[PDB]
Design a protein around this nucleic acid. Structure first.
Lengths: 97, 1048
RNA sequence: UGAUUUCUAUUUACGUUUUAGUACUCUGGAAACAGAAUCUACUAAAACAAGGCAAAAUGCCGUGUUUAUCUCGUCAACUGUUGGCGAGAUC
């Protein structure tokens, strides 16, 4: 299962964090710059094509309801478009969006 | 022949070497080579004194030539006399009346002695008398609008009474005019040829130009302009045929600017480096349009923000350091004609003209002789340019080649030099048996590091010769530039540690405990961050910190896996959960992920506001926290290891390049590497090899051994191989297969004291001392003294007292209050002494009473006079000490009533003889050596007299001779020779080898005089000579009886 | 714990001291000046790291760097005994 865990609006795009989590492993992928055309159109098919850091591998958490930033974590298939509405105000608090 | 990991520690006075077995980690050997610290002040003084001798000899020879000329035309004879001739009066009289031969030639000689200045432009700052030389000459010439120099000199002599001084500064043009008018009217009575007048005028207004140099026979001279030019610039280190370029050339400026530009890192959606078109657009639109570039202009050039840009050279304050365009903008502010300013060859020629030529008219004539589109008024404006000096490292050919390679690629000078691997072609490294030491000479390094490199290179040579070719060599260079820079750093370290200690004492007095002393690191980190974690921005209370720190961890921002940076600029006191969620991640790679706290934009705002706040964040730490790069690439690991693990300083860079080139030319596969100092510091700290270093010279070897072990660790783990392949610049095949991941892996591989006890418990070190045998050192003390023979038979030296009208010179009051009989006016002028004592008793409150007297009355002290018309006192002669040892120079002074001597005959060596079973010795002073054309010969007469002084018999079996630091062994005890202390009492001064005697006494807190003096007489069992290798192996010495007299 | 500048060239006006003169002072003195000291100043000539070259010359070297002692010796400078470049050897 792939979760959209954190997002940050930039001048020309979006920084995205995606946790691919199987039964016992959580792999965190950081995409520093995702084009705005892919974000605003929920083109989740183009996640991997963008450059990303090597996945940080850790033990899987029990559930992925809330991260440290309090943002509501959504599944990648639900699209970043809905994430933009989930916590637009919480992202406005910490200067991302 | 066992392969070893050679370790070198290079300092300013020591070269420590450690030989450690390659596959068993045991210590094969360890030693220290010692040498006095080289200093540019000695050469500077020698050069200044050589120039002074040149000036004096030239003036004297000019006077002798005028004398020969006057003897030719019978203006004098070998029977004339000018005892009563005052040259000033006769010189002013020659302008209007007849001069006798005796009156004429005296004025001519007095003119030839002091002839003024040709070019007013060249002048020094040696003016304590507040007067510019140019300004003084201009004021005098303005006073000379309707007067000759003779008239002005004589009228000043008649008005005040002074002629000589800083006011007698004229230019040669005016003296020449006066001499010409004198010859004009004086030609009628004495038969003088026109060619004679021209010869005298020539002898008056002729001086050597700065490009002709010394005449024939001088080893420092030359033949024509080409030879002087080649000598000044010097052959390129790489290209023997092409000479070096000027430091402020156009091509060199552009090369440095593009190096700076290629060192850039920009956080943009495009390539993070700089492309070709962007670089050319920057050069034209920013560099060619502004003199001193700023980060703001280069940022706004390519539509980026200045804050997103990283990796720029910085100044001492925190401003970007970008290469400014010197010649381009110095020319553009005079003419904007594209043909003149753009042509690179024209600007290169202008740079070469302005640098090696300095007088205005020569610059004009040689730019005029550079036939081009150049106008004439532009030459007039360009002549007055300033600040074009220096010689570049490489020639213009290599400059252009590296310029092409820099324009087209993204590499810098370091990367290009590592890539192409061009070899020094001055001395061919192929058919040379040993390491060439002359290659260090061509490098533009200070003589201190130059001497240190020569010593280290010869030590490596001896190690290779006596043990075979090594496998791995590692070299660490000291941080200190000279002793004074070391003292600056030591003073700042003690001051900062004292301030932190006082702050910790204040904190401990606030809360109350000895608990604050153990928390230093954390407490300082917290202090630099106003009690705030950086990952989570949660408040970090200081009371909670003092109570239970275990939840506040000192996390390393960039992982120890790649960064290798353990410095203070790489620690953040944070919550335990943040560190547990960080792991082997960077704050950029962590803060945006799920496991983290508040997002990255808030942290960026906080950290950029803290970096601007009171300088609490270093630039290095600020760049660490905002590393938005993927540390999993090879480029970032390469950058990190090159910066914080390899010595990027130019000196170590050149030493490395030389060693690697010599090893690769002979196809000898040997790997050499250099290591950063802070890393070895962290190693020595966490190993606890020796926390405090006071044992002595042995320390210099120890660290060497340590870094050898360091190299050892970089061979024992397949993961670390990448670092081993970066610290040596050995080509690695995208590999990235083995690695070190958890910072605990760093702690296990590095901190673990593997084979540390064997490095501690070693007690068989070696020491080698340097012997200075060069004669013709400082012979005598420069100042010259007079003597007076008092009623007591002992002779007395007269010291002078200057500057009687300063404010912090209480020496006169000291002399009058302690014992006034030391002054000479006590015995030979008691009335003036009584007046001076009255003034002294008058102004006790002020420090120097005579200054306050002069400031309140406007008249400095006058000698006792019945009509009150006595002269001025400016200096006072007073008695000094006796005359025990002295060099008498009475023969040089005619019919002197007092013996004139100089002090402190400097000793050169001492030869130990054995006469009838008792040891004696003769001290050979530096005066006893005559310098016959690079053949130094000991004066047989003076040496025989010195032998006779000690009543040394002829049958005395000569034992040996000892120069500086030649090891001696007396009574069975071995020492090093500092030198003759008092030859008359048969005493010498020695010292220990493994430690200084001062430190030997400071270890046991002894208060004995920290210097060892031994007496060589019948109270001495034996005297033997011992030397050492350039590695530290002791050896006896065949006397080769009949001590050395000739020195090549 | 916090990133290169060597080598060299030209000239000026100072300063130290000796000698000589002058000024200053102090003895027998109306004076000439006979005379003492060389303290304090001014002017002139000369020496200024000891010295070694060179022969009318815009003359030269002399406080810098390298410096592990001494051997057989090949080939060299030289007013006879040390320097490359090798073979060698150490209480």
């Amino acid at each position: 299962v792939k979760y959209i865990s954190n997002m940050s609006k930039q001048e020309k795009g979006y920084r995205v964090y995606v946790n691919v989590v199987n039964e016992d492993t959580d792999k965190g992928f950081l995409f520093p710059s995702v084009p705005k055309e892919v974000i605003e159109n929920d083109k989740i098919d183009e996640l991997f094509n963008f450059e990303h850091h090597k996945p940080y591998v850790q033990k899987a958490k029990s559930r992925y309801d809330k991260n440290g930033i309090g943002y509501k974590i959504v599944q990648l298939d639900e699209g970043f478009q809905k994430f933009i509405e989930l916590n637009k105000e919480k992202m406005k608090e910490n200067l991302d969006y | 022949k066992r392969n070893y990991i050679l370790g070198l520690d290079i300092g300013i006075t020591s070269v420590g070497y450690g030989i450690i077995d390659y596959e068993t980690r045991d210590v094969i050997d360890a030693g220290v080579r010692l040498f006095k610290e080289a200093n540019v002040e000695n050469n500077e003084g020698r050069r200044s004194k050589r120039g002074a001798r040149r000036l004096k000899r030239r003036r004297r020879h000019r006077i002798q030539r005028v004398k020969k000329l006057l003897f030719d035309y019978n203006l004098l004879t070998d029977h004339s006399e000018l005892s009563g001739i005052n040259p000033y009066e006769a010189r002013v009289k020659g302008l209007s009346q007849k001069l006798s031969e005796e009156e004429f030639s005296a004025a001519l000689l007095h003119l030839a002695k002091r002839r003024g200045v040709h070019n007013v432009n060249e002048v020094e700052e040696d003016t304590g008398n507040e007067l510019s030389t140019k300004e003084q000459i201009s004021r005098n010439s303005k006073a000379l609008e309707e007067k000759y120099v003779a008239e002005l000199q004589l009228e000043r002599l008649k008005k005040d009474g002074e002629v000589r001084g800083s006011i007698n500064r004229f230019k040669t043009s005016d003296y020449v005019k006066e001499a010409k008018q004198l010859l004009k009217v004086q030609k009628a009575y004495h038969q003088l040829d026109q060619s004679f007048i021209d010869t005298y005028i020539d002898l008056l207004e002729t001086r050597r130009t700065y490009y002709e140099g010394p005449g024939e026979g001088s080893p420092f001279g030359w033949k024509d302009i080409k030879e002087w030019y080649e000598m000044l610039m010097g052959h390129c280190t790489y290209f023997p045929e092409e000479l070096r370029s000027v430091k402020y050339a156009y091509n060199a400026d552009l090369y440095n600017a593009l190096n700076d530009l290629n060192n850039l890192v920009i956080t943009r959606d495009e390539n993070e480096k700089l492309e070709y078109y962007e670089k050319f657009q920057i050069i034209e639109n920013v560099f060619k349009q502004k003199k001193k570039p700023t980060l703001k202009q280069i940022a706004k050039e390519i539509l980026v923000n200045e804050e997103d840009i990283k990796g720029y050279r910085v100044t001492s304050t925190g401003k970007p350091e970008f290469t400014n365009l010197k010649v381009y903008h110095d020319i553009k502010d005079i003419t904007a004609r594209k043909e003149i300013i753009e042509n690179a060859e024209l600007l290169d020629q202008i740079a070469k003209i302005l640098t090696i030529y300095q007088s205005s008219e020569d610059i004009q004539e040689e730019l005029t002789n550079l036939n081009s589109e150049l106008t004439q008024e532009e030459i007039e404006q360009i002549s007055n340019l300033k600040g074009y000096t220096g010689t570049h490292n490489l020639s213009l050919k290599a400059i252009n080649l590296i310029l092409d390679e820099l324009w087209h690629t993204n590499d810098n000078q370091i990367a290009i030099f590592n890539r192409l691997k061009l070899v020094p072609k001055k001395v061919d490294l192929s058919q040379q048996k040993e390491i060439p030491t002359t290659l260090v000479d061509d490098f533009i390094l200070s003589p201190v590091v130059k001497r240190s490199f020569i010593q280290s290179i010869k030590v490596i040579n001896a190690i290779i010769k006596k043990y075979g070719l090594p496998n791995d060599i590692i070299i660490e260079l000291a941080r200190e530039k000279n002793s004074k820079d070391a003292q600056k750093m030591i003073n700042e370290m003690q001051k900062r540690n004292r301030q932190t200690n006082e702050r910790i004492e204040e904190i401990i007095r606030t809360t109350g405990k000895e608990n604050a002393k153990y928390l230093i690191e954390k407490i300082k980190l917290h202090d630099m961050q106003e009690g705030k974690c950086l990952y989570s921005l949660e408040a970090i209370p200081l009371e909670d910190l003092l109570n239970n720190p275990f939840n506040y961890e000192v996390d390393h921002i960039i992982p120890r896996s790649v960064s290798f940076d353990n410095s203070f600029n790489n620690k953040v006191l944070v919550k335990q959960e943040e560190n547990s969620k960080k792991g082997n991640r960077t704050p950029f790679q962590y803060l945006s992920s799920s496991d983290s706290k508040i997002s990255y934009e808030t942290f960026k705002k906080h950290i950029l506001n803290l970096a601007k706040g009171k300088g609490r964040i270093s630039k290095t730490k600020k760049e660490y926290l905002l590393e938005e790069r993927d540390i999993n690439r090879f480029s970032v690991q390469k950058d990190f290891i090159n910066r914080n693990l390899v010595d990027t300083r130019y000196a170590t860079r050149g030493l490395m390049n030389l060693l690697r080139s010599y090893f690769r030319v002979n196809n000898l596969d040997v790997k050499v590497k250099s290591i950063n100092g802070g890393f070895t510091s962290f190693l020595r700290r966490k190993w606890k090899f020796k926390k405090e270093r006071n044992k002595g010279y042995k320390h210099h070897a120890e660290d060497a051994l340590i870094i050898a072990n360091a190299d050892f660790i970089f061979k024992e783990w397949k993961k670390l191989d990448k670092a081993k392949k970066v610290m040596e610049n050995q080509m690695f095949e995208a590999e990235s297969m083995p690695e070190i991941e958890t910072e605990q892996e760093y702690k296990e591989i590095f901190i673990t004291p593997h084979q540390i006890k064997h490095i501690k418990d070693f007690k068989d070190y070696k020491y080698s001392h340097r012997v200075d045998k060069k004669p013709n050192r400082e012979l005598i003390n420069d100042t010259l003294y007079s003597t007076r023979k008092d009623d007591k038979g002992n002779t007395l030296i007269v010291n002078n007292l200057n500057g009687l009208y300063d404010k912090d010179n209480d020496k006169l009051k000291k002399l009058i209050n302690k014992s006034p009989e030391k002054l000479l006016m006590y015995h030979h002028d008691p009335q003036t002494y009584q007046k001076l004592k009255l003034i002294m008793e008058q102004y006790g409150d002020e420090k120097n009473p005579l200054y306050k007297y002069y400031e309140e009355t406007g008249n400095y002290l006058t000698k006792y006079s019945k009509k009150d018309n006595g002269p001025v006192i400016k200096k006072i002669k007073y008695y000094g000490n006796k005359l025990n040892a002295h060099l008498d120079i009475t023969d040089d002074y005619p019919n002197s009533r007092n013996k004139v001597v100089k002090l402190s005959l400097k000793p050169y060596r001492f030869d130990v003889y054995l006469d009838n079973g008792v040891y004696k010795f003769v001290t050979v002073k530096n005066l006893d050596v005559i310098k016959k054309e690079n053949y130094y010969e000991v004066n047989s007469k003076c040496y025989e007299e010195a032998k006779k002084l000690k009543k040394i018999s002829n049958q005395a079996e000569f034992i040996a001779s000892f120069y500086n630091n030649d090891l001696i062994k007396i009574n069975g005890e071995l020492y090093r020779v500092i030198g003759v202390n008092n030859d008359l009492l048969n005493r010498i001064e020695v010292n220990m080898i493994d430690i200084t005697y001062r430190e030997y006494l400071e270890n046991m807190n002894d208060k004995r005089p920290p210097r060892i003096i031994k007496t060589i007489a019948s109270k001495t069992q034996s005297i033997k000579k011992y030397s050492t290798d350039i590695l530290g192996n002791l050896y006896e010495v065949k006397s080769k009886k009949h001590p050395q007299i000739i020195k090549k």
